[PDB]
């Protein structure tokens, strides 16, 4: 594949460990050296493992790599706050003739209790509707860890088009916030009845809905 499969996120408390997998088709990773990169979303990635299991200068033995031939794994033991980052694997894919990255895994080093998202759903304003457009806004705040998935429904049916969600950003209290937008024409707004924003966080959903006729 042109992207290696990684879990979207992992978390653990300081002092604990995590394992991050990176997989390709069949045993394609036996044929290539896998490298791992650490990125704080505000900055460039940094090399932490090369040649499956070697560490560059300055990287502690807390970081280790393995490669099963099918799946490569990054192990991060003795977790510290500064380890918090997105992690990517990478390797040459000879079947595609390209250097391929994994899809990335967000690591949270748990510094406060879980906090479920506070969701608010807004209808389009009459002012926007005068321009022949309608945007619903679903604000999402005070969640920790900073990972959510957002699903929209219109008339009880999943929306597949016209949705976009921001990447979570940190609040002053180190919880996270994000916003999701459903963009429709004014006519489509007028021709549907119920609208729902569903936020999944740590395996549980928080949903807000409205009816246009209110």
């Amino acid at each position: 594949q042109s992207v290696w499969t990684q879990p979207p996120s992992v978390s653990a408390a300081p002092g604990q460990k995590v394992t991050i997998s990176c997989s390709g088709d069949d045993s394609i990773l036996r044929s290539a050296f896998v490298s791992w990169y650490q990125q704080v979303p505000g900055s460039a990635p940094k090399l932490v493992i090369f040649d499956d299991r070697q560490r560059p200068s300055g990287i502690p033995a807390r970081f280790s790599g393995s490669n099963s031939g099918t799946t490569a794994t990054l192990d991060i033991a003795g977790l510290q706050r500064g380890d918090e980052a997105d992690y990517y694997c990478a390797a040459w894919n000879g079947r595609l003739s390209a250097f391929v990255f994994g899809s990335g895994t967000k690591l949270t080093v748990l510094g406060q209790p879980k906090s479920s998202p506070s969701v608010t759903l807004f209808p389009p304003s009459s002012e926007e509707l005068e321009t022949n457009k309608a945007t619903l806004v679903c604000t999402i705040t005070d969640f920790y860890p900073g990972v959510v998935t957002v699903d929209w429904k219109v008339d009880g049916t999943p929306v597949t088009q016209g949705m976009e969600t921001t990447q979570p950003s940190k609040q002053s209290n180190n919880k996270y916030m994000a916003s999701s937008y459903l963009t429709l024409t004014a006519r489509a707004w007028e021709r549907h009845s119920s609208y729902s924003c569903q936020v999944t966080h740590e395996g549980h959903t928080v949903e807000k809905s409205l009816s246009r006729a209110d």
Binding site: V3, L47, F50, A90, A91, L96, S97, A98, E128
Partner: protein, 216 residues
């Protein structure tokens, strides 16, 4: 001590060519390393574009190979990227990287990155729409700040004597224009008796909009 730095225009018009440079300091470009380019779209993953070595050998992402030219000039400690026929899909953070040759294929160091925005937009002030509840212990209002260019805006709120909590969300680039939003939370049963206004300042268009949030 090896350092990389990307430079070039932050704005590129669709159909035109994106041209970026990377300057290498503290390390010889005549060694057995490739020099290449990676990009990353906001909130998405990393995409390898290609690389070059001092002998002239180049590697390109096959899906982009017809549009991509990567070259180097060690006399200027430079690596260049030229991507023709730009689309809105080419907006990204672009990174130059040193790459170890051979079977190792590792990337280190990376430049800090340069933000490339692909858009045909003119300077456009935002359209600011009020976010009021559809018909608990707090109420949340907001402002939708839509269709502006370029970045950035600042949103401030005036909720009088009310205690408030403001959440200002990052912008999304959608068809060459930015959209963002901001919310303010005040105690339930205060507003609308007590007034709440967002002020949205877009210095590029010399425009500030002061929108009072009215009940529906």
């Amino acid at each position: 001590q090896v350092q990389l730095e990307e430079s070039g225009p932050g704005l590129v018009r669709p159909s035109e060519t994106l041209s970026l440079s990377c300057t290498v300091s503290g390390f010889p470009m005549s060694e057995s390393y490739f020099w290449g380019w990676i990009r990353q779209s906001p909130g998405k993953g990393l995409e390898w574009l290609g690389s070059v070595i001092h002998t002239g050998t180049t590697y390109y992402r096959p899906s982009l190979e017809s549009r991509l030219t990567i070259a180097m000039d060690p006399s200027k400690n430079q690596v260049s990227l030229s991507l023709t026929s730009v689309t809105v899909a080419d907006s990204a953070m672009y990174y130059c990287v040193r790459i170890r040759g051979g079977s190792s294929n590792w990337l280190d160091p990376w430049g800090p990155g340069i933000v490339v925005t692909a858009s045909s937009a003119k300077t456009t002030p935002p359209s600011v729409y009020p976010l009021a509840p559809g018909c608990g212990s707090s109420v949340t209002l907001g402002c939708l700040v839509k269709g502006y260019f370029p970045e950035s805006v600042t949103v401030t709120w005036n909720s009088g004597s009310l205690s408030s909590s403001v959440h200002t969300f990052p912008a999304l680039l959608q068809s060459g224009l930015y959209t963002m939003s901001s919310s303010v939370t005040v105690p339930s049963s205060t507003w609308p008796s007590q007034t709440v206004t967002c002020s949205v300042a877009h210095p590029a268009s010399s425009t500030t909009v002061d929108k009072k949030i009215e009940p529906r």
